[PDB]
Amino acid sequence: AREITDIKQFLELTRRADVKTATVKINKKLNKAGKPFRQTKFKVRGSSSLYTLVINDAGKAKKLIQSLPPTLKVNRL
Amino acid sequence: AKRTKKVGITGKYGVRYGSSLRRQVKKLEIQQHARYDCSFCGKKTVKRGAAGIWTCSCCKKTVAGGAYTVSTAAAATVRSTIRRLREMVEA
Amino acid sequence: SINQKLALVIKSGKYTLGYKSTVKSLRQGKSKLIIIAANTPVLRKSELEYYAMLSKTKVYYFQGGNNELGTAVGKLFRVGVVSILEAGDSDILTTL
Amino acid sequence: AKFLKAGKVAVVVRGRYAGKKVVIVKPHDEGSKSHPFGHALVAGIERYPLKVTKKHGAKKVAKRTKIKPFIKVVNYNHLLPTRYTLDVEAFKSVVSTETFEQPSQREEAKKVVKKAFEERHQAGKNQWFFSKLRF
Amino acid sequence: GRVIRNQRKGAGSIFTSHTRLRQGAAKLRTLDYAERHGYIRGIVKQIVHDSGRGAPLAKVVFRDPYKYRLREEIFIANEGVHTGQFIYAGKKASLNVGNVLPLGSVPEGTIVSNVEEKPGDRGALARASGNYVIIIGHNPDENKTRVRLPSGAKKVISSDARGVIGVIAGGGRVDKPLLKAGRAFHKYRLKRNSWPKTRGVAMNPVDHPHGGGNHQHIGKASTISRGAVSGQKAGLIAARRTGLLRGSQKT
Amino acid sequence: AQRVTFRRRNPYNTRSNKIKVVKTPGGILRAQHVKKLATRPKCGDCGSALQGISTLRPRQYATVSKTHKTVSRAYGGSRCANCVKERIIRAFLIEEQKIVKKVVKEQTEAAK
RNA sequence: GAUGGGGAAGCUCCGUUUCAAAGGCCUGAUUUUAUGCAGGCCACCAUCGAAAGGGAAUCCGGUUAAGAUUCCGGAACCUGGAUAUGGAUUCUUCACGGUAACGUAACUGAAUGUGGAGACGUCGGCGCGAGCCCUGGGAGGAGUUAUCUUUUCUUCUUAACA
RNA sequence: CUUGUGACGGCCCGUGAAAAUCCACAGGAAGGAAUAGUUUUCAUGCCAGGUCGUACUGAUAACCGCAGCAGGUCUCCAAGG
RNA sequence: AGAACUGGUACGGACAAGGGGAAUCUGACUGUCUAAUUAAAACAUAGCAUUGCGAUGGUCAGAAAGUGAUGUUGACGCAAU
Ligand SMILES: [Mg+2]
Ligand SMILES: [Mg+2]
Ligand SMILES: [Mg+2]
Ligand SMILES: [Mg+2]
Ligand SMILES: [Mg+2]
Ligand SMILES: [Mg+2]
Ligand SMILES: [Mg+2]
Ligand SMILES: [Mg+2]
Ligand SMILES: [Mg+2]
Ligand SMILES: [Mg+2]
Ligand SMILES: [Mg+2]
Ligand SMILES: [Mg+2]
Ligand SMILES: [Mg+2]
Ligand SMILES: [Mg+2]
Ligand SMILES: [Mg+2]
Ligand SMILES: [Mg+2]
Ligand SMILES: [Mg+2]
Ligand SMILES: [Mg+2]
Ligand SMILES: [Mg+2]
Ligand SMILES: [Mg+2]
Ligand SMILES: [Mg+2]
Ligand SMILES: [Mg+2]
Ligand SMILES: [Mg+2]
Ligand SMILES: [Mg+2]
Ligand SMILES: [Mg+2]
Ligand SMILES: [Mg+2]
Ligand SMILES: [Mg+2]
Ligand SMILES: [Mg+2]
Ligand SMILES: [Mg+2]
Ligand SMILES: [Zn+2]
């Protein structure tokens, strides 16, 4: 329910010691009339709120999923 | 244009209640709805809120007065008498 | 009366109209005399005497309200206070 | 004659320090580029000293005499000049136009004016200036 | 016969006054040490319309001299009182409109209103809109004052009773004709259930002394002696005279 | 042209039972009740709606931080700013007048 | 409508702050120990009375033979209570900036007092919002087609909360 | 069109509830730091949220009129021409 | 708003939708009542007039009361016609 725009804050937020699960949503969006790109959403289920991080870059998305802690349950959908 | 000859504000009562009664009701409502000078702010902004309550739109002052006018003649006579008694008793 | 002296001030000298203008002038020390209408808010009156006393300025109280003072200076609106910056050709500063 | 001089005590009527005694340190009648209006460089007190009686001994006196000063640019329209006065010599140098525009010299000027205020208040000088305006 | 209407009011079933919207009982400030030894100052805050009352109310705020509180009083507003006006009450108060000077310390010919009949009962006399009391003279020994009530009767009351200077605001109210059963309906809707009134002569004889007959007529004399019992007092009670008043009252 | 119904058991169009028809992600029209509108706080002296303060129902003020309920001036969340200015002016002037009156009184008593 | 009271032979009646000795509230002190002494404070002075008045806080999708704002899934909020970390602030002890209206992530505060909200009529017109109605383009589906009809109907939606 | 809302204006011898409850301010009692504190109106974190109603009709058949009676019974939403 | 053209003079084409005038009696008017035979010229009403009362009071209630209604009232009021 709360959006996060800082990657450092997000990666820190993945180590809050209360979060157990997260999900990664892939969307197909259009930047303008010609070019469709792939939207990726990072949602971390906090104890009290849901934090969503949105990335419009595929490369950054790959680097970030690579950088998630292994102890966190990730869902692909 | 001039809409009525004599009824004026009491045209809303139509042909009923009798001529004379409508006459003095007009005579009083004209005073009731009129605008009065602010004794404090000096403007034509004093209106009647309720019976006897006269307040000024600007300067936010309210003065207790007559039910149908800002002040009656008896009030003026009383105020003058009080002033006479004050300047008689202090000197 | 005194209104003729005021009129000659207006036609000859310089002056200000209004509370903000007069307090600004009195703050700068350019005011020689101030005139207060009868029904001026007494708190405003009192701060005016305090300012004048701080500025060593003569004070006169108009025997009339805002409307009478405004007509005295020859204006179609009401004036609560006037400040005299220069007499020009008048005599109010010497008398009263 | 103009009266807003470099030693007059005034009262702030508007702003965060409304009702606080201030002393004019540096006047500016014809405004400035940063402030196109008649403004000053007053120094005041935010937390007035508490009342002290015979009963308090040797530390409650010290705690109850603490002074929190402040320095600000204020429009002349937001001051009431007083007939009182309080000379400024020990901290007229530190308070200046360039004393502001960065936080540091503000705070070490506040320190000097705090020292000057508490020194005067320790002696029997300017009780009215240190007395809180009740309203 | 049946119990007549005027008897039926005393039970107070539906005949009690409608007191929802009234702002409170309009009483003077209680008579304490300050008033009988000096004067006290007050501030007029609100001038409020009172439901079921022609005169407006004056809501004056006082200071409690014994405890740090803000006693608030409800006065009847005199004509000429304004919000923010300072009000002085006490023996040593200055004789000004809205002040509450005791009748002992006020010269003859003064106008007062809301006058106490005994000291400390917080105002009885002359409490209606446009009404006032004349002070005629004093009796310094065995302190005593003679005053003129709105009824025209002369009454002698104690010199320590209080009364506010001025005339009750709202005068001339009864001058405007109502023109409408609706206007009277709304007027009495906030006072009590006493309207409309049915003529006794148009009643059956079981309902009223006047009722009955093949023509609407009272039959007997309509002037009822004061020695009559409840249920007979229907008409002109203890009428000294009757008929149109031609000439001076000679009071 | 769907027609909605009250979502609660009070069928009377009272103040506490106002509704606002809204469209849901399900594509249907569903009535939703709206709470009574908040009234702005008012100044103690000038009687006007003093600004800078959040406007909520009275109980809901217990939930928000101190910042939303006050201003950083004396009489912050209580009195109008112009009211504060005029009362400061009144206080100063009347106190100075009190000193003036006492010096005049001691002068006149010393004269006789 | 109890109580203190006052009537009535009595069933009971009056009265709801009245001719009353009409109480609990916080801090602490003592750490035989539990709570009395240490204090201070305060003066309404029972209770009942509204499923349409006032009122702390929830929405969406799905599910049953019959329940759903109650169940399931997801996402919030309020009250009460404990609390730990981060943040904030302090050597000028209890923050700063803006001339000002005022702003922020915070940014001590008891007794007592003041103020605000709760909290408010009806009617006429005007502005603004939401929903509905109308309609264009486009992407699907259905109907009529002896003849005509870029045609007729229909789906294109986004809650509380931040 | 329905409805909500704002600024208004008209009307009154009618000026059109109260309480619970929450907050702010004034006040400065008290408590407070430097080798360390103070702070839970800032963020995050932990636990709990008791009791009763919840189906259905609400009317030319589920209510009252002896009844499966052309009677009576409060209210919400209201498409096109 | 106007102008041509057109039709078995039709055209607010269904629906929807005031008859009018001259007078007399009576009530001024809006309003209310005999649920289930009488809605009126009856009642009420605004206006007018009269009476009582300054509270240790007027009118009225209770068996009594340290009891009540008017009365959160005070003659521009309350009460009775
Ligand atoms: Mg009746
Ligand atoms: Mg009959
Ligand atoms: Mg009989
Ligand atoms: Mg008869
Ligand atoms: Mg409710
Ligand atoms: Mg703010
Ligand atoms: Mg805000
Ligand atoms: Mg009882
Ligand atoms: Mg209850
Ligand atoms: Mg309820
Ligand atoms: Mg209500
Ligand atoms: Mg909700
Ligand atoms: Mg169901
Ligand atoms: Mg659930
Ligand atoms: Mg900060
Ligand atoms: Mg309020
Ligand atoms: Mg959205
Ligand atoms: Mg409606
Ligand atoms: Mg209105
Ligand atoms: Mg159910
Ligand atoms: Mg159900
Ligand atoms: Mg149902
Ligand atoms: Mg139904
Ligand atoms: Mg139905
Ligand atoms: Mg049945
Ligand atoms: Mg019949
Ligand atoms: Mg009939
Ligand atoms: Mg009749
Ligand atoms: Mg009586
Ligand atoms: Zn005014």
Q: Which residues contact E99 (CB under 8 A, 6 or more apart)?
A: E87, E88, E89, E93, E164, E165
The two tokens of residue C58 are: 């003569």
Q: How far apart are CA B51 and CA B65, in angstroms?
A: 9
Provide φ and ψ at A49, rounded to 5°: -145, 160
Pairwise CA distance, residues E5 & E230, whole Å: 11
Pairing of strands F19-23, F29-33: antiparallel
Joined tokens for residue B89: 């008793």
B10, amino acid identity: T
For chain G, which bases have at least one atom within 7 A of a protein Cβ? 51-62, 69, 74-79, 92-108, 112-120, 129-133, 155-162
Cis peptide, bond prior to residue D81, ω within 30 of zero: no
C67 touches chain B (CB under 8 A): yes
b/e for D47-80, b at 16 or more Cβ within 10 A?
A: ebbeeeeeeeeeeeeeeeeebebbbbebebebbb
- Asked if residue B48 lies in contact with residue B32, where contact means CB atoms within 8 angstroms, the answer is yes
By what method was this entry solved? Answer: cryo-EM
Coil, strand or helix at D27: strand
Of F58, F11, F53, nearest to F35 (Cα)?
F58
Look up residue D97 and give its DSSP letter.
Answer: T
Q: Do the two chains A and C touch, given a threshold of 8 Å on CB pairs and at least 3 pairs?
A: no
In DSSP notation, C36-51 reads E-TTS-HHHHHHHHHH
> How close, in Å, is residue D60 to chain C by CA atoms?
39
Residue D75: strand, helix, or coil = strand
What's the CA angle centered on B59, arms B53 and B65, to 5 degrees? 20
- Residues in chain B preceding a C-to-N separation beyond 2.5 angstroms (breaks): none
**What separation, in Å, do the N-terminal and C-terminal C-alpha atoms of chain E show?**
41
User: Among partner residues F72, F85, F96, which is closest to D13 by beta-carbon distance?
Assistant: F85
**Alpha-carbon span E89 to E163, nearest angstrom:** 10
CA angle A13, A17, A18 (to 5 degrees): 90
Residue type for D109, please?
A: A
C-alpha to C-alpha distances, F95 to A20, E110, E205, F90, F101, nearest whole angstrom: 68, 35, 77, 8, 10
Q: How far is D85 from chain F (nearest CA, A)?
A: 15
Residues with Cβ within 8 Å of F62's Cβ and at least 6 positions away in sequence, in order, are: none
With a CB-CB cutoff of 8 Å, which residues 7-66 of chain C face chain B?
39, 41, 65-66
CA E182 to C1' I30 (Å) is: 10
- Start-end of H helices in chain D: 60-64, 103-122, 127-130
Q: How far apart are CA E220 and CA E202, in angstroms?
A: 15
| Dist. CA B77–CA D55, nearest whole Å | 63
Instruction: Give chain A's length.
Output: 77
DSSP assignment of B16-81: -S-HHHHHHHHHHHHHHH--EE-TTT-SEEEEEEETTEEEESSTT-EEE--SSSS--HHHHHHHHH
CA distance B7 to A40: 80
Q: Cβ distance B49 to B61 under 8 Å?
A: no
Q: Which of the nucleotides in strand H have any atom less than 7 Å away from a protein CB atom?
A: 3-6, 11-17, 20-29, 31-32, 41-46, 53, 74-79
Do the Cβ atoms of E58 and E44 come closer than 8 Å? yes
Residue type, E1: G
- At F24, list the tokens: 């849901």
Round to whole Å and give the CA distance between B78 and B73: 9
CA–chain centroid gap for E153, Å, is: 15
Q: Looking at chain D, how many residues does it have?
A: 135
Reference B62, options E73, F87, E44; nearest CA is: E44
Chain F residues with CB under 8 Å of C46 CB are 93, 97
C43 touches chain D (CB under 8 A): no
Beta carbons within 8 Å of B77's beta carbon, 6+ residues apart: none
Residues 6 or more apart whose CB falls under 8 angstroms from that of E228 comprise E237
**For chain C, first and last CA: distance in Å?**
12
Question: How remote is the C-alpha of E152 from its chain's centroid?
Answer: 14
The verdict on a CB contact (< 8 Å) between E175 and B79 is no
- Whether cis (ω within 30° of 0) applies to the bond prior to E196 is yes
Q: F86 vs C47: CB contact, 8 Å cut-off?
A: no
- Cβ neighbors of B1 (< 8 A, separation 6 or more) are none
How far apart CA C40 and CA C46 sit, in angstroms, is: 10
Using only C-alpha atoms, chain A has a radius of gyration, in whole angstroms, of 13
Please give the Cα distance from D84 to D80 (Å, whole number): 11
Q: Which amino acid is at E227?
A: G
Residue D45, phi then psi, degrees to nearest 5: -130, 130
Distance CA C17, CA E212 (A): 81
Q: Are B40 and B56 in contact (CB under 8 A)?
A: yes
User: Distance between CA E104 and CA E169 in Å, rounded?
Assistant: 24
If you write DSSP's letter for every residue of E174-201 in order, what string do you get? Answer: GGS----HHHHHHHHTTT-S--S---GG
From the number of C-beta atoms within 10 Å of its C-beta (0-12, 13-18, 19+), residue C37 rates as: buried
Contact list, D2 vs chain C (CB under 8 Å): 27-29, 55
Please report the beta strands in chain C, taking only residues with DSSP state E, as ranges in sequence order. 14-17, 33-36, 58-61, 81-86
Q: How many CA atoms lie within 13 A of D111 on its CB side?
A: 5
Strands C81-86 and E223-224: unpaired
E89-111 CB burial, b ≥16 within 10 A, e <16: bbbebebbbbbbbbbbebeeebb
* Token pair listed for B56: 């000024």
What is the spatial distance between Cα B32 and Cα B55, in angstroms, rounded to a whole number? 13
D84 touches chain C (CB under 8 A): no
Distance from the Cα of C4 to chain D's closest Cα (Å) equals 28
